[PDB]
Amino acid sequence: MIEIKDKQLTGLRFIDLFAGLGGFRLALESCGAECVYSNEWDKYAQEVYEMNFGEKPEGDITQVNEKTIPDHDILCAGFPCQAFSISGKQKGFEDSRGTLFFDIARIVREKKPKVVFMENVKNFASHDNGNTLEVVKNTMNELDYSFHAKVLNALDYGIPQKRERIYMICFRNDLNIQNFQFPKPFELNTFVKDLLLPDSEVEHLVIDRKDLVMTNQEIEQTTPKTVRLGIVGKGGQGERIYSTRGIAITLSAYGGGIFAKTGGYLVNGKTRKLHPRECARVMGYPDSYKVHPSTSQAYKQFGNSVVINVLQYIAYNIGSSLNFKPY
Numbered sequence: 356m357i358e359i360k361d362k363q364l365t366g367l368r369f370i371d372l373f374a375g376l377g378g379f380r381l382a383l384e385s386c387g388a389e390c391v392y393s394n395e396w397d398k399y400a401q402e403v404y405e406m407n408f409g410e411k412p413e414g415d416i417t418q419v420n421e422k423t424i425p426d427h428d429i430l431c432a433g434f435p436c437q438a439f440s441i442s443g444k445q446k447g448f449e450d451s452r453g454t455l456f457f458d459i460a461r462i463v464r465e466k467k468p469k470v471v472f473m474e475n476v477k478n479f480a481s482h483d484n485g486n487t488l489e490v491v492k493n494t495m496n497e498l499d500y501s502f503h504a505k506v507l508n509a510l511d512y513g514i515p516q517k518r519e520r521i522y523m524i525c526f527r528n529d530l531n532i533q534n535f536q537f538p539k540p541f542e543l544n545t546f547v548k549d550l551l552l553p554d555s556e557v558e559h560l561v562i563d564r565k566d567l568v569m570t571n572q573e574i575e576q577t578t579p580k581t582v583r584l585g586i587v588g589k590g591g592q593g594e595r596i597y598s599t600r601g602i603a604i605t606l607s608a609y610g611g612g613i614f615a616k617t618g619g620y621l622v623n624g625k626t627r628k629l630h631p632r633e634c635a636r637v638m639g640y641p642d643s644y645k646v647h648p649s650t651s652q653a654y655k656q657f658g659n660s661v662v663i664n665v666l667q668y669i670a671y672n673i674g675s676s677l678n679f680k681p682y
């Protein structure tokens with residue numbers, strides 16, 4: 356989490372949908388915006404949320420009437436990707452029913468926020484030979500919004516982890532915003548080796564194996580790439596060893612293998628899995644954030660979340676365009 360100097364969104368209100376851990380909340384709250392509504396149905400997630408923020412997000416969203424959602428200026432939603440059963444009139448609003456995205460849209464159509472802010476996985480722009488994107492695009496256009504989207508990788512914004520995701524930023528057409536742009540990349544200076552806790556606190560994550568094979572020499576200088584040092588078992592998902600002097604591999608919420616959701620790292624002669632705290636850090640989160648007591652849920656929650664840093668940079672640029680209005 357990089358801390359922002361110029362608080363561009365002071366005064367502007369927002370809502371937290373599919374809140375999860377509340378990554379969007381931390382990101383916009385660092386730019387001065389204030390939260391007025393939160394929604395998330397996962398029991399284990401609402402718990403870690405009220406632990407930090409003090410409120411229990413509201414329950415199941417498809418049961419919430421849109422006329423009961425507070426006036427707000429920005430709508431945040433890191434929603435789950437689903438295929439659409441669209442054999443209808445080209446693309447559009449109605450062709451959304453049955454999806455979770457539909458809930459976003461039904462809320463936009465009635466509350467008209469100035470901006471709509473979303474994110475999804477890297478292979479979203481190509482899902483179903485192009486028609487998943489198309490639909491989200493044509494639905495926004497119908498509700499009278501501009502549509503900007505680009506794929507960014509977290510190793511380009513100060514976080515050492517390979518991780519491409521798609522960010523979508525929409526502005527109502529009546530605000531006439533034709534100068535917005537995505538953040539520029541910068542050289543990386545923090546590496547996995549810098550995020551580790553002292554060995555004492557991670558002994559119980561060490562995993563010994565006799566079928567361990569070292570394919571490469573250990574790296575001496577830091578690099579902005581993932582460096583594979585060995586294999587365990589067959590050499591597939593969850594059975595690869597990476598260097599602590601390169602970048603961390605993509606955290607996953609539901610991966611398998613011996614080194615399950617975090618991958619395995621060579622740290623001081625032994626091979627271990629990352630701890631939840633070294634996980635928060637690789638996602639951008641700050642040490643003041645109280646993590647969930649169960650290591651299993653925490654790996655799920657973190658692999659599903661957002662890289663804080665990248666969101667902060669875009670939140671700043673949003674405030675920018677909105678705040679530039681000369682005579």
Ligand SMILES: C[S@@+](CC[C@H](N)C(=O)[O-])C[C@H]1O[C@@H](n2cnc3c(N)ncnc32)[C@H](O)[C@@H]1O
Binds near residue numbers: 379
């Ligand atoms: C990809 S993620 C959360 C990402 C969020 N940026 C965060 O930082 O964790 C999707 C979220 O959708 C929530 N969710 C799925 N279906 C829901 C529903 N019907 N009502 C409320 N929350 C729902 C999931 O539980 C998960 O918390």
